[PDB]
């Protein structure tokens, strides 16, 4: 009932930036917090950063706080993530996920999209 | 605001179980859901469970969803985290959070416990 589409995954150099994009349809109004998670090749799906729906207040893990900001808009029922001085251990496949209100965990996930970061 | 403290947790052998648990004090009324991460060697840390403090729901993500199981006991303070069926890739020191209402993210930590397979 609530639909999720990452966009802007792609290939970047070592110190460079790139933004991700997920759009949100169905009844967003019954979201609290939206968060970007990351799977690199082999590995676990790992948090990164959250923020709240209707708050735009922000968290973020130690491994990305200071180069990635999270950040909404209500209007365009968008999140993004900007990622500044990414590396190589950057590379993985990105999924934007929605948590409901009064719900608990992530109840609903996009496709993915891949980004990579070259030395 | 709120100080947690863990306890639990040690040398286990492959195929076995561990229990892990912690404590809350203080604005303990506050505190919207709970949850378990995990730090190797190294590594990042990496959300596990989480359980809602006042409605009891869980989640768990596909790396420990079927084996791992969440639980809280609201009146003695206290979360809990049983771990069944563990592999050595659960090798790990175990961190619990908790989430202030109307806040995000994980706001208090608790000082972590090791979980060695
Ligand atoms: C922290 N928090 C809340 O405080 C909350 C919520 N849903 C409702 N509320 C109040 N969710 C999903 C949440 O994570």
Same mark, same amino acid.
């Given at each position: 009932? &609530? ?9 970047? =150099? ?44 922000t968290?973020?893990?130690?491994? &990305? ?20 001085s990414?590396?190589?251990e ?20 996009? =496709?993915?999209?891949?980004?990579? &970061?070259?030395?």
């Amino acid at each position: 009932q &609530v639909q999720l589409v990452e966009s802007g995954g792609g290939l970047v =150099q070592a110190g460079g930036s790139l933004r991700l994009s997920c759009t949100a349809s169905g009844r967003t109004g019954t979201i609290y917090s939206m968060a970007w998670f990351r799977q690199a090749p082999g590995k676990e799906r790992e948090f990164l950063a959250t923020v709240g729906w209707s708050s735009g207040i922000t968290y973020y893990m130690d491994s &990305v706080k200071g180069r990635f900001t999270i950040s909404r808009d209500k209007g365009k029922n968008t999140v993004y993530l900007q990622m500044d001085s990414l590396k190589p251990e950057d590379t993985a496949v990105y999924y934007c996920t929605a948590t409901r209100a009064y719900s608990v965990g992530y109840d609903y996930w996009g =496709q993915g999209t891949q980004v990579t &970061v070259s030395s």
